[PDB]
Amino acid sequence: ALAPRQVLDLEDLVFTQGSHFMANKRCQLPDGSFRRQRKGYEEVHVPALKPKPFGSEEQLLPVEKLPKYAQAGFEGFKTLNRIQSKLYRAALETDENLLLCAPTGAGKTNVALMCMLREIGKHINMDGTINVDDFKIIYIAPMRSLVQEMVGSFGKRLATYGITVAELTGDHQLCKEEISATQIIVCTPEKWDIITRKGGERTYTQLVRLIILDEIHLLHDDRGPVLEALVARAIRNIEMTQEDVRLIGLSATLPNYEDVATFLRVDPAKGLFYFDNSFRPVPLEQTYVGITEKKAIKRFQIMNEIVYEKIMEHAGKNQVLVFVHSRKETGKTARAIRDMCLEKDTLGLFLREGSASTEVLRTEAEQCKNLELKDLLPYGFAIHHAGMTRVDRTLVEDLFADKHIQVLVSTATLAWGVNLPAHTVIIKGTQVYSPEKGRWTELGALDILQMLGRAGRPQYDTKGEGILITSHGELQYYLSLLNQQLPIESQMVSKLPDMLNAEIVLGNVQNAKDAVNWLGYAYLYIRMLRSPTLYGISHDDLKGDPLLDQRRLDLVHTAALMLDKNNLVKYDKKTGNFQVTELGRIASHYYITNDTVQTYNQLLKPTLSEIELFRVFSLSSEFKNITVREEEKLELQKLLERVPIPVKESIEEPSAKINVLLQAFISQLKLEGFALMADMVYVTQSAGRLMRAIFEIVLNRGWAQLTDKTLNLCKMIDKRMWQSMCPLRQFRKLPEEVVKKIEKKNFPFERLYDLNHNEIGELIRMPKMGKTIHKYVHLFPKLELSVHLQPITRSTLKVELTITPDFQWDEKVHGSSEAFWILVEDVDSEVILHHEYFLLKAKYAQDEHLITFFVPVFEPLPPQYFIRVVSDRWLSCETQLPVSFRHLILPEKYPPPTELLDLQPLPVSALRNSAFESLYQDKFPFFNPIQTQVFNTVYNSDDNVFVGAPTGSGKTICAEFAILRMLLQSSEGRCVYITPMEALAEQVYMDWYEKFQDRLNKKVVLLTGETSTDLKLLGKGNIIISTPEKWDILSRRWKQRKNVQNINLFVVDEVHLIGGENGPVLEVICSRMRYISSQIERPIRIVALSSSLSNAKDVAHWLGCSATSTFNFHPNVRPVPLELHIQGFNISHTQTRLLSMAKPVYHAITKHSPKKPVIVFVPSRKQTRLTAIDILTTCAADIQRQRFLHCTEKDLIPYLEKLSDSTLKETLLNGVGYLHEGLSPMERRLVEQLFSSGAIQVVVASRSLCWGMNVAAHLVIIMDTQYYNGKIHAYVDYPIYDVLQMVGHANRPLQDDEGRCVIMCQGSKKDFFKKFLYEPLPVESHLDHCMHDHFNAEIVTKTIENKQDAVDYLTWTFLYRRMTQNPNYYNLQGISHRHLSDHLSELVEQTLSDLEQSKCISIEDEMDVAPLNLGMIAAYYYINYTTIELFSMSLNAKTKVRGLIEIISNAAEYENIPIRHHEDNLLRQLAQKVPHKLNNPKFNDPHVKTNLLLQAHLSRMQLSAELQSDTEEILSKAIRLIQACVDVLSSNGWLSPALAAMELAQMVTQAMWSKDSYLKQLPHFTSEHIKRCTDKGVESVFDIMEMEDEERNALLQLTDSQIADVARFCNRYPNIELSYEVVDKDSIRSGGPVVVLVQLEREEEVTGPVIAPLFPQKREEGWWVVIGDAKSNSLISIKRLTLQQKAKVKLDFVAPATGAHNYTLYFMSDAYMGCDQEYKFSVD
Ligand SMILES: N=C(N)NS(=O)(=O)c1ccc(N)cc1
């Protein structure tokens, strides 16, 4: 972006005066102007503008004529203004941008209220009052008092609608619970500026529909720029969001209004309104005076003379008000008026001619006041300023509204924050004091205009009188300010650098080019275009650049050079690109000037003292022109000794002045010099932001001591107290005296925790205060800290800090939340090696919290680290914990990785078989380096090999390599491929089916999970592939299963998932395969593919891999090089961090792959949709439009014509695809196909899909890297394996010479990612935590029998190898073999005891153990022992279907069922729809969630997509669990419970409740036809299949495809007749075996599987035969069977004594409802 540009002296082009850069050469005094000179005391008097007619339809509109709802806001008014009528039409009936130029006091408020009511009534419900969570309105006001007046009045007006208005302007910040529950935010421009330059501005700006800007003439003021800035951002955002917001502007009658109309994007014909002062609310006659020379006495006395004359002129029923510029001047005015009244015969008295009483009566009666109120109130006068109480201020205001107070002198605050008008207004002088300029200046425009607009009460005056007193040399200017002739200019050039940085930091300006465009968005651009001479531009240069390219480029270049000098931004001369500094980011977010940044960066140091800290604070360039006046030096010397910090920096120069003023603010020391008070206030209202800025600067750098100093200084400024004082001062309902008494005694605060209330009262000598002191002591926040550490590597330790609360919560004291900083410091407490922002919410305030993070350690290992948790707001609220590293081992360091040499790549010709080459020659001509190296050992050496290489580097085909010789050595061999994830298994199954059974014609299958079907598929396949669970349940019985023994090849992929959840299953199945290879004496070849592991040798020796077969490569030695970019976001609240990272993903796309494909991963599905849409709208804003679409819309139309999601159609035809599990697999494969084709450039995917997508990009972006766990009501970091898979998705060697990935994460995590992603990953076993189930399952198979071989088994585990090299990770404190064996024996003992207490095993002596019924059926159904124990203890003799479902939902396998954000609310909603209602339900409990899901499924209820996937996950194991329940119910002998359990099985199959019609089971059916049938006679499916064809088809009244789909279910319906015989019936007596034989016939053969559309897995008929006694509720015998036409069943059971033994024979199903039989019989 090279272009000619020259640096500029911005001082020449800036209007130095500001506020009043007089562009008006001469003010044309109106008609009726006379100038009576009196040598000073001149009177340039203009008349009141006479009224105007109502000619052109103009009329005061009746409030009843308004739209009916909007009449609520205008209640109390029976009409509205003329301006208000024209604007009623415009504003209430249109959404057009508006700009109202009207004189001061003309109304303004009510027209903005109409604009608000537009939006308020847009979101109406039919009978719901409003949609508060849908629209957010804001109101920008120039002064704080105006903000407060506005929020009060607007609340009063529109409370009827149910809206909530509030003020955000205050010294507090980062507190935003009110922004959530307030629909109309009133704020100052700089407030909204600091809010909307914060990252994640959308959190506030998302629901913004209406932006009002009151008193837009602020553009001329020095505060002008921020306004511009605001508008610019807003407008640009309404372009980037494509969500229109309405801009309302309110200005006074001043010129250049058309330019701000262009600025505000108002149509001059539709939204531009201008009213000259003939539309003034009360016609105003004004007089201006001048001063002759410098005579203070003369000035003040002449002011007083004018005041006395004009006040006396308005004696009765009139109020002549006076405005002063200081609180020392209102008292002086009262004094002077009273005195010169007295001096001249005390005349003017009895202004209220009812001297006896009237108003004097009420004044004296209400006289219980202070200061100068009690004397001037009966006299008739009054004063009003900020240094008064609320009661007395409101009392003066009331008695003035009562028109009983006559004269009132006040300051500008009354004119801004109170609706208090008067007949006459006298501006006493116009010189005010500015601490910013450090000098006396002239007043601002807004003050003068608001004050002189107060003249003339609205309904009580026919004419007003404004009187202004100033100097002569200013007259012509004030004449311009009050007669529509002072032009509005732009002060942007002086504020250009700062502003520019705020846009560089905000990411809205990445180059100088969009900087220039932004400058075009400003008011400065328009104002330069239409008056270039006063902006430094010639009329010829305007011809050269009509769009002013050169001037805007020069300006942004100067600002960028300034920001580069001060190091807020790095700016390169050539490309014109910007790069943000953390200095600049802090400067923007904390609203501080770049010179201050430079001073900080050159002065702040880790060894800085608190004295030097106060000095640096005083050197801020916000105070660079403050002066030490002689009139205050003695008071400064007095304050210096009364403050604690030395202030050695100087003597009595401005830095020492600032310092001592701040310390007098902290110490609450009173002052006397009024200029000194003004300067103090000006320093203190900024000191908070300045100190927070310094604190962030030092925190990010890790400097610990300065961090503590600075945070404490922030809190001392906030709470108005030093650290020497007692923290009890922070409770503001405590006395000052009592806390001073506590401080007098040298008893530290902490010991009050361990003290009686009576002993407290005795210590303080105040017994009555002791109870409340104890209360507040236990209300003070204190945290308990507990730590669990486990080494990960010699450089990194995993820490699990457990934060426990230890105080009473009070919403008044602590509010909705309490913030904390977690800090990890080294031994010297110098360097902060890690830190985090913790937040204790109010709801979970008493729950325990767990914080996992990682710290670094380097040898020589220090004795201990420190972990401090320090409150962000409370002083002396720190809890420290030393973590000792004295008994900590450092894990055995890993060796270097197997180097990949630069060897000639092997072409496909090395693979000699032509059919084998066929597949690999159609893709690539030669192999990549790592697979060229691994080829020798894998495909041609029958060695056990482990290859470790980054994800996506093409390691999969390496397995194929081995497989090749596999198929070469055996005809119909048996190889087993094991992958941890299911979706990866499905992808590799499709690929290898295409590669083998469809190409080589060798049967390749993937195990489905059902026992019989999977064991059948086992024998067929030459290649069987599976997940570790389906393979575990098959291989656990490797004695009876012959097929699992003759396995030529076992390949396990992604073995590094041993360390993740569901990892112990992989570990045990691999160890079992190794043990089988040992026993069979036929060495099963093992080949393992994994990521780059550090401890790859351990897993290599685990599987018998020689070092000639270990292939573990440094992750840098990828086939495709990768450029990783970790990018931190120091933002806590994740819902706002996502909105912040919004724009960075677009800028990352444009930076790292502007044309090439990208994948961006997000933590949700709604996030996939939203990210797709926001990328779309940003590309529309840039008008790139087709940047992400590389084909034609007509090319896609046929494809997208079959997609069901409308937004997916739109986003796809616009270039970007989204992949979320809320849509069909067909849509997923379609989007993947379009992406890999090149038509779709970018795809945004849910995290859950990072395993099952066969899609490669050039750039992989990751968002957030956190997801919400609602079981702990917090956010969890991603598993490292997921993000590593995502990163591996970035390397494709098809096209690119490089791979690019950027991860966007909270700062707390950044370091973490970096390290573990740049170097190999250490992995360990979690088998010791999930070991009991495998012992319970291998006692059943007799593989384990005693304790010694239970120890022998662990030798096969990876756990055995890892417990040695990393002891402390498994909490063993030794590395000798003694420690190993001791830990193993303790583990086996613990597991066996836990299993015995569960009634699953029996132990005898100390060796031999034996299975029990519970453990046998727990291993038979692959069910956890806890679930079986719970089943056995909970199932009672009389358990009904409701209790059946309850006990089912409590299973441990359903604890994995998660709880996500806002999901507790959805479960609350579902609780009232399900037929059975459980009391005392906790809605973050997975078990009540599963119960609700089961009740909704049985009731055939549709719900969310995530909840549907969860319902599928539960239904997968539902039948397993209910079969286990049937078995234990049989083993305990209860009859009707087991019958109800079989009923529950067949209920969960086809989603039928227990007592609904059986007709509900056939498909294509709703309740109306079952109502017709059951009312007319058809009650069962047998009635359906008994009817003739035509009478049924007529009874159906359905389509021809419906009858065809009904017939298939009516045919699959089992039709079985039973045959039962009691063998040797005549030969039966007591105690003898009784044998009942049962036989079954099925007319049709196995036509197909069980038909159940609402069940995900295709099941097969399972039947149950039962012998029961219906009276004893006794189940005698039972058998489950699988039926194929012919059956033969036997049931043997003993007999009791002779009696009426009437038995029942039950035939139950586990699938269908209504095909169950009950036959009574008798045997004696
Ligand atoms: N970045 C780290 N080390 N921690 S943080 O939670 O992300 C964080 C949060 C907020 C602020 N202001 C700074 C930092």
Residue numbers in the entry: 402 to 2125
Reported in the publication:
We identified sulfaguanidine [4-amino-N-(aminoiminomethyl)-benzolsulfonamide], a known antibacterial drug, as a ligand of hBRR2T1 in a crystallization screen with additives (Silver Bullets condition 12; Hampton Research, catalogue No. HR2-096). In this hBRR2T1 crystal structure, sulfaguanidine is positioned at the interface between the two helicase cassettes, directly contacting the N-terminal HB and IG domains as well as the C-terminal RecA2 domain. The para-positioned amino group forms a hydrogen bond to Glu1097 of the HB domain and the guanidine moiety is contacted by a hydrogen bond to the main chain of His1236 of the IG domain. Furthermore, the binding is supported by π-stacking interactions with Tyr1238 and van der Waals interactions of the benzene ring with Trp1222 (N-terminal IG domain) and Asn1531 (N-terminal RecA2 domain). Sulfaguanidine occupies a different binding site displaced by about 9 Å from BRR2-inhibitory compounds and did not influence the RNA helicase activity of hBRR2T1. The primary hot spot (16 interacting probes) is located at the interface between the cassettes, coinciding with the position of known hBRR2 inhibitors. A second hot spot (13 interacting probes) overlaps with the original sulfaguanidine-binding site. While compound 33a efficiently inhibited hBRR2T1-mediated U4/U6 unwinding (45% of the unwinding amplitude of the DMSO control after 2 min), we did not detect any effect of sulfaguanidine on unwinding at 300 µM or 1 mM. Sulfaguanidine itself did not bind to the hBRR2T1–hJab1ΔC crystals.
